[PDB]
Chains A and B, each alone.
Chain A
Amino acid sequence: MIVVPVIERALKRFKRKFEKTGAVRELRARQAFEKPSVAKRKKMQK
């Protein structure tokens, strides 16, 4: 629930807030299913 009360400055602020929150990253993650083994091994490799 990112709120940017207020046009170019407001839009840049909203985009920056969304990027900081990382909603698109979690949306891309939730688009598909990942096995717990896959997640654990990705974390171990990273």
Chain B
Amino acid sequence: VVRVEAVGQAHIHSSFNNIIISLANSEGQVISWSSAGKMGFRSSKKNTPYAAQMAAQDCAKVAYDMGLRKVTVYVKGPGNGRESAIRTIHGAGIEVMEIIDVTPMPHNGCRPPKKRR
């Protein structure tokens, strides 16, 4: 039981190891999602623009045939491929409205986990 009428929000959660693209309606209810690991890029190449393009194309094709036409992009986390995903969901029928970087930064919060040697 979902209902996405005309416009929605795309969420990209990237990191140094993987990228997850998830499209949702105005109430943040996900209708489709994809990732490099889902596409089958289990390697160091999970953080590749090609993998991001493949995942974004799959997600956009899966979600376009549901009434989704316009989307607003939110991006969290670093990593190559966010631009590729944005371009792919822009060119796969879905029209982008704005690009918003919601990457969370701390105002000196909790302690980071040590340092690798």
A-B contact count (CB 8 A): 66
Number of interface residues of A (CB under 8 A): 25
In whole angstroms, what is the CA distance A30 to B109 when docked?
A: 10
Q: Is the beta-carbon distance between B102 and A1 smaller than 8 angstroms?
A: yes
Q: Is the beta-carbon distance between B100 and A7 smaller than 8 angstroms?
A: no
Interface SS of A by simple majority: helix
Q: Is the beta-carbon distance between B99 and A3 smaller than 8 angstroms?
A: yes
Q: Is the beta-carbon distance between A2 and B100 smaller than 8 angstroms?
A: yes
Binary contact track B68-92/A, C-beta < 8 Å → 1, others 0: 0000000001100001001100110
Closest approach, in angstroms, between the C-beta of B88 and any C-beta of chain A?
A: 10
Binary contact track A1-27/B, C-beta < 8 Å → 1, others 0: 111111110110011011001011011
Task: Using CB atoms and an 8 Å cutoff, list the residues of chain B in contact with chain A.
Answer: 77-78, 83, 86-87, 90-91, 96-103, 105-106, 111-116
